[PDB]
Amino acid sequence: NVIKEFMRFKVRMEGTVNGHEFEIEGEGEGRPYEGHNTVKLKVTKGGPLPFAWDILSPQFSMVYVKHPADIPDYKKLSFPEGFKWERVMNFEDGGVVTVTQDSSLQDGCFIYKVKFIGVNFPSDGPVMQKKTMGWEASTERLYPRDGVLKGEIHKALKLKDGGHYLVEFKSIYMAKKPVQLPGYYYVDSKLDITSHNEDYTIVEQYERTEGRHHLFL
Amino acid sequence: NVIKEFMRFKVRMEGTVNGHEFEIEGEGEGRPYEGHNTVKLKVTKGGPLPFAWDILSPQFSMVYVKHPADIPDYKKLSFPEGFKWERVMNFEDGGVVTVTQDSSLQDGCFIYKVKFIGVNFPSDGPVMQKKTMGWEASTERLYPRDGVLKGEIHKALKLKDGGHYLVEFKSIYMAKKPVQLPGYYYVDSKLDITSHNEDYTIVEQYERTEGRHHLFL
Amino acid sequence: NVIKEFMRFKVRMEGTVNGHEFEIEGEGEGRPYEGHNTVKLKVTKGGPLPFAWDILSPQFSMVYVKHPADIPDYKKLSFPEGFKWERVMNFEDGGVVTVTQDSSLQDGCFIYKVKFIGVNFPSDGPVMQKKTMGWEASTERLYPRDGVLKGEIHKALKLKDGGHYLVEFKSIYMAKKPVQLPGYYYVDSKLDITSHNEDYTIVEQYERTEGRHHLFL
Amino acid sequence: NVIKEFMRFKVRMEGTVNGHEFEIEGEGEGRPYEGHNTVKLKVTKGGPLPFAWDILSPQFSMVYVKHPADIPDYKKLSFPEGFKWERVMNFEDGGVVTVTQDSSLQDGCFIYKVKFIGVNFPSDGPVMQKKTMGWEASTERLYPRDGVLKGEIHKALKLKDGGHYLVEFKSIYMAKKPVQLPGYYYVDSKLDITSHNEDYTIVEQYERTEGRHHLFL
């Protein structure tokens, strides 16, 4: 058993949003089978960020999803060999982000490398004007396809002037070696910002995530 | 209270899919507060349909969703005045459908009028070739906006040879008179075809729908 | 023989936008081989319209596109048998419209029946607030697929306070009998409102449309 | 006057498609005011590429677009100060790519740095199975918005059997210093692969691009 009750992770992101380049480094920890993890991030280059932190938050840890016995945990089964994931986030005002990540296990610690490109965000929009107030709790729809696991989520960012800012997530989870695939199921998640300095250069996050079948099934 | 423990409904649909016109008439019944309803449909014109019945199934009854005390039931509160709903269904192979519906309570019985336009479906596709095997159970994400209630769902049609055919639903629920709006919540649903003749000209359906808050809230 | 140098048409539209139902009747005329036509419309029911006329304008005449000798005029060749077309218009603020039309030739005059459903237009938007100032001239991209002719356009509505309101058009042109298909080509078009009363219940339009190959070929 | 009749460029691309990382280096040349340029590429890492070269080809030179005297050449006027461009490519089978590029002028030679992330491409699709055979000639629709220039194109990749693979391009052109903006206009382009080795590790391209007003103006 390579995925222990307690596992630590290191994450590094290299990104670009509306032409602004940045680098983020971080360290995280959590309980893989209990469905929760924390992460501490630091902007190492391109700081302070001229956009909302919230668009970066869901990109900083697959192995921390609590899965019941009957639904195979594809993401956990991918280790020690390796794991990769990719995502497209379609924002309602035209913004589009594509993310690609590489996950490896080195000496009982997960190493995550994230590449992020965000484009077409309006200048007067909530992302560029930093008007977002965190994510609402979400429900991902997962299904197997092409030998990999795919997920779709209808997410929303809370606005300070009131209301929501809609984002559609489409994710593809790829194990290095094709491991056991689950059926049609759901993953409930909730990401919260627990700490931050004034310009969001140092941020701490907490995520709660649990996989399940549909309530009627 | 005009919405009783047992309510009946009449449905009338006028539609077009890939240039083929059709008319469907139906009668249904159910328990509004327990979250379940049945409906018997008959194709009255344009029969037999040269496409999958499944794309028409979710268009045939908002008042039948079980809601807990804490979440305002916008759809039930819209009566006896009136209710209207609109929807766009985006299929993964390019097929797009827009639906518009009118709802009124005429002497303890609901009268539903539906208009449907389906376009851009590939000729060798699962809808036109009738390769679908019913909907998977789903979870709608709802939120208030512009004084009305909106909802989005990531749905899927089961395929005969195995696999899924993805469809994204975006619905807008409009009360005639601006009634109380709920917050950010979810609606679980499961629609099943319970009876049908060989050419799907006489079809019976069953649906169970329940509104709830996110599991982590 | 059937498509004369001068041809007239009658059009009837039954529609719905954001729950509001309407009916429009009109008469038109033009020169098929010269690439121009005029049309006089009148709102017969649901008047005055609570939205911008501009979204309806491109739905009111395929046979009037000038084509050079080397490019097969699919739409003209579909007659006297029949023609049908479908369309989806995706607006940048979430508005979606699907249109379906049936074209017939009776008594030496074309008869057009249009069904229109418009959904998800924000209440504070330029369509519902009537802030649009006509269409910009456009260029459609056409290609054959599934035995029919398809077309895609990146169109824009001029704004009153300045700027543009973007709309993506995806059309499907279907002959009743499988007629000769053209290759990958373009159709330049410009639609102008030439006359209108205050509430847009009586409107006149003019369209110039010409088919051609890409200029670098 | 910093942009001469003959200008050379160096290009470097760091990218990822369906999890596969790659690095491409190249050198090109052309005549800015005449509207044509050539480029010689070499895959330096991640070679041989397990996907179609054609999706990379339009990412390898804004200053080589011929513009008439009346339409301001935003991209040429961006120099010596600098220029940046971003793009999203939406493929019809689900594939999404976001591109971000930085353009500088160093000692009479243009330096281009490109970052590419391609996600959600089907394993059995024409991109991953290398079944595409070049781009069709295209027409871009440009318009000013938020102090920058934006452009939309309906492009197509030719398929080996005798069909097309559709891709929608949405580009954003950003000068470092807010320079003169043009109006609503078009850019015709034609990209051809002129030379390639067996595995597409060494490729040569040619592009012809000209800006113009709509033909009906």
UniProtKB/Swiss-Prot annotation, chains A, B, C, D:
Gene3D superfamilies: 3.30.1300.40, Green fluorescent protein
Protein modification: Contains a chromophore consisting of modified amino acid residues. The chromophore is formed by autocatalytic backbone condensation between Xaa-N and Gly-(N+2), oxidation of Tyr-(N+1) to didehydrotyrosine, and formation of a double bond to the alpha-amino nitrogen of residue Xaa-N. Maturation of the chromophore requires nothing other than molecular oxygen.
Superkingdom as given in the UniProt entry: Eukaryota
Pfam families for the chain: GFP
Transmembrane domains' residue ranges: none
Record keyword ATP-binding present: no
InterPro entries documented for this protein: GFP, GFP-related, Green_fluorescent_prot
Subunit architecture: Homotetramer.
Protein name, as recorded: Red fluorescent protein drFP583
